Subunit: 171 residues, 4 copies
């Protein structure tokens, strides 16, 4: 034999190990419209109808947004928009209520409950009405047979919805 | 009631969904030493003994390195170094062989097989010998009862070892 | 060389591959007590106080139940019971309301919302009152710094609570 | 109000929580054939060619076996068999060697290394030759662009192959 001494400068004692990390995908939609009927005297919603253009999704990453539109997700060719239609607002108090409505994602419809939190019914500087309010709720992918090819392991069955609204009186 | 029109500038239609991502943690060690006996005439290793100071770990993130030293991993207070001791080199050809040795991590010892790939036995510019070679192999965390508190789900049971060596003749 | 023909009877062409499966752990508690004040005239809860002996857990598997009592979960030596204390019942209608209360698990307390669904206020055969009702809600392990050693990956951050009650008038 | 006392017999204090579990899927194949050339004088394989009918898979569960044949796995309509072809046997000793060959799964081919362990070259009762031996190795799904729709998270990238053989001399 013969003896050698490492050259530490071009020697590497290395390892690779595989681990999982959980993270929230958080996105909005740039293009949607709604119809908002609300009675400040009784702090009750009368009509709330939303339509969201699936095309306009934004999860802060343009290449994933495209992927969202494909058949294993949105199918935005066949189903260009998702819709919400209020069927019932059950008041809790003047700040709080339980909105029940029909959500449709890619042609499938389920009734959902959103939690309404009224964040200040003012009369804005110009003398015309404003309202702020939020809608919050959890829907299950499986209820809408959504992304069915993707397992509940890789991607959560639960989707959390936060809708934040400022809004001004009509005409 | 009253009708409102969204102000799109301070309205947000948002969602959060939880997904998993797999990734390789890849690290070296800055401080280790070895004893290398190798016969270029027969391209056979005679003795290979490595000691790695656990303290010197580097997974490109100083806060995780600290965590590695703690009780749920290395226990580098009690067990400051990990060691490898060659017990057998079985030649395949002049470029290849199967090294069997004793690895000890935090006081526990198992016999492992590394795959030796001899990357060029030259005689360097100064007239003194050099060798390059790599050692590769997979060890299982569970074999060394390592990180036992962390599940094989979050972090892989398999650790991949790549050792890259350049080395110069002694005296 | 020489040629051979497999004996199919003592030959096996085998593979192993590792996969994940999600599943619900579903358990009750055999021993708990509560204080129930409820006004059938207005279908409103007045007081609801529950205490559950952690010791009495049952997830249909006696060896996991023991494990639940240990330091990485319940710590039932130090914290033998978990408690719920109603702070507010906000009526939705005669069948529905939103109960807010203080839940304590292993010494830590958070305010939670349960969904009350009143399932029939009858007067039982003997002339004395009965009520049926359910309480449902989701709590997050992380809110109670519960099982903190176990990742949100292996075990879900979300715990779903279903409390089913039949109950009879006092004295 | 009015006071009530739980009826413990029709009251349930329940929870559901979601957890992951890892497990090995372990299967064989009932129908395959091979060509085996082996020289007991030098304990070296000369030719080893295997063909496995994908149709004949068995993971101890008939409904998963069917699923294996579908487009997101085997595609056994289009690709009815998988094949292994020895290209090189590099001897380690009389009990051990490193077999390199071409594996094809659903039309895609990669060179793999199996670990040969010769388990006893006897001459059976009738005066004709027998051999026992095993082949072991790990292949990566990703190398064969196999099950590409299924994530490396749900199902492991690594497949472990164990081939166990008894075999008798020809004619």
């Amino acid at each position: 034999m013969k003896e050698y001494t490492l050259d530490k400068a071009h020697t590497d004692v290395c390892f690779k190990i595989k681990h999982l990390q959980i993270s929230n995908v958080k996105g909005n939609f740039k293009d949607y419209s709604a119809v908002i009927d609300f009675d400040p005297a009784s702090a009750e919603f009368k009509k709330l109808d939303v339509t969201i253009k699936i095309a306009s999704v934004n999860t802060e990453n343009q290449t994933r947004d495209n992927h969202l539109q494909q058949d294993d997700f949105f199918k935005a060719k066949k189903y260009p928009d998702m819709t919400f239609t209020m069927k019932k607002y059950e008041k809790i108090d003047n700040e709080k209520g339980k909105m029940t409505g029909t959500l449709t994602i890619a042609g499938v419809s389920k009734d959902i409950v959103l939690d309404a939190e009224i964040g200040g019914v003012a009369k804005g500087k110009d003398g015309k009405e404003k309202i702020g309010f939020s809608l919050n709720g959890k829907i299950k992918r499986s209820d809408f047979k959504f992304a069915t090819s993707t397992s509940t392991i890789t991607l959560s069955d639960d989707i959390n919805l936060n809708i934040e609204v400022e809004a001004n009186e009509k005409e």
